[PDB]
Amino acid sequence: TEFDGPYVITPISGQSTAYWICDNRLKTTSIEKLQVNRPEHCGDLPETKLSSEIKQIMPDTYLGIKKVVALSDVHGQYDVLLTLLKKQKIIDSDGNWAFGEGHMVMTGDIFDRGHQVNEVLWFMYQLDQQARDAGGMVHLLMGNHEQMVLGGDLRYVHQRYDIATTLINRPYNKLYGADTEIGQWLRSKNTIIKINDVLYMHGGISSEWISRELTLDKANALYRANVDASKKSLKADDLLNFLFFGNGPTWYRGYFSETFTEAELDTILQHFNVNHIVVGHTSQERVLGLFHNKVIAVDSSIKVGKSGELLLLENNRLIRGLYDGTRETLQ
Ligand SMILES: [Ca+2]
Ligand SMILES: [Ca+2]
Numbered sequence: 173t174e175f176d177g178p179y180v181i182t183p184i185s186g187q188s189t190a191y192w193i194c195d196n197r198l199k200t201t202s203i204e205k206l207q208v209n210r211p212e213h214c215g216d217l218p219e220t221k222l223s224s225e226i227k228q229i230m231p232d233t234y235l236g237i238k239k240v241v242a243l244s245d246v247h248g249q250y251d252v253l254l255t256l257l258k259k260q261k262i263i264d265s266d267g268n269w270a271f272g273e274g275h276m277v278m279t280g281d282i283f284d285r286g287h288q289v290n291e292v293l294w295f296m297y298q299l300d301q302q303a304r305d306a307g308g309m310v311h312l313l314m315g316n317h318e319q320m321v322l323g324g325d326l327r328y329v330h331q332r333y334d335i336a337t338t339l340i341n342r343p344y345n346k347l348y349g350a351d352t353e354i355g356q357w358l359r360s361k362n363t364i365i366k367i368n369d370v371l372y373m374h375g376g377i378s379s380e381w382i383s384r385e386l387t388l389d390k391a392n393a394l395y396r397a398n399v400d401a402s403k404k405s406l407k408a409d410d411l412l413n414f415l416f417f418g419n420g421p422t423w424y425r426g427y428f429s430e431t432f433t434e435a436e437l438d439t440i441l442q443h444f445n446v447n448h449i450v451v452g453h454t455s456q457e458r459v460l461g462l463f464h465n466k467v468i469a470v471d472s473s474i475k476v477g478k479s480g481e482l483l484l485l486e487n488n489r490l491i492r493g494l495y496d497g498t499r500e501t502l503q
Contacts, residue, residue, distance in 0.1 A: 175215035180352060195213065250288035259496060379439070457473060465503045
């Protein structure tokens with residue numbers, strides 16, 4: 173018995189439509205008053221109030237933010253994510269934003285591997301709005317998997333989603349295209365941001381970024397404008413080629429290389445005028461710091477589906493939030 177969704181289509185003017193996979197059967201509903209309500213016989217699929225404002229493109233640079241929490245690579249593990257957030261009191265008993273005016277930075281990779289991808293997406297979409305309502309903010313950054321899915325690289329999509337692509341009659345990448353609520357939401361997000369003296373991105377920044385004289389604004393804009401480009405077009409343009417692949421911000425794993433040095437790291441820190449760089453992408457056994465904590469790895473292997481951790485940046489300290497709800501100071 174499989175339940176999945178909803179997959180919401182949002183036209184320019186028209187009313188939105190929701191597709192639900194319920195017991196391997198398709199259910200289609202017309203959204204009224206921006207309220208996405210699940211049909212009868214559709215298990216416990218997520219229901220959410222559609223928002224216009226959270227699809228607005230937001231700045232990629234922030235100052236004077238008192239508290240920030242970072243985590244990454246949920247990879248469809250909703251239960252783990254929810255447990256971690258409740259244990260660390262980021263959300264309340266009902267699973268609603270409880271971080272006040274704080275900012276959350278999810279450095280990408282919600283998609284793939286896991287079996288609760290839509291659960292994670294709709295939850296994050298809701299948090300996005302709830303955070304804004306509280307005067308806080310949710311920074312959902314695009315990871316390499318978000319780029320892969322939207323672009324058509326489906327090698328890591330969980331097999332259970334073949335049901336959806338079959339019933340809704342369209343490939344997985346089109347289940348999150350520009351005509352879908354989630355797709356529109358994702359296409360408004362940044363890929364690299366800076367909060368206070370910290371830089372955040374999925375993989376990491378390599379020296380090539382400096383060679384190309386890139387800026388957060390130019391990069392984030394290109395990412396949004398080309399996430400739907402053909403692989404041919406992306407690899408043809410050497411700038412887009414760098415941004416979207418191997419040595420780029422969403423794929424670079426150099427910070428976890430044996431040959432990478434703190435000296436080289438310093439040149440990168442100095443280039444952005446930051447003291448730390450928070451990255452996901454390369455899975456660790458726990459949230460940890462490298463090079464005297466100049467780099468903080470926040471991919472705590474939530475993808476494994478058993479546990480996860482987060483990073484809390486407040487009062488100039490770097491704190492590790494364990495799955496059991498306890499904390500350990502890194503710096
Ligand atoms: Ca990942
Ligand atoms: Ca990744």
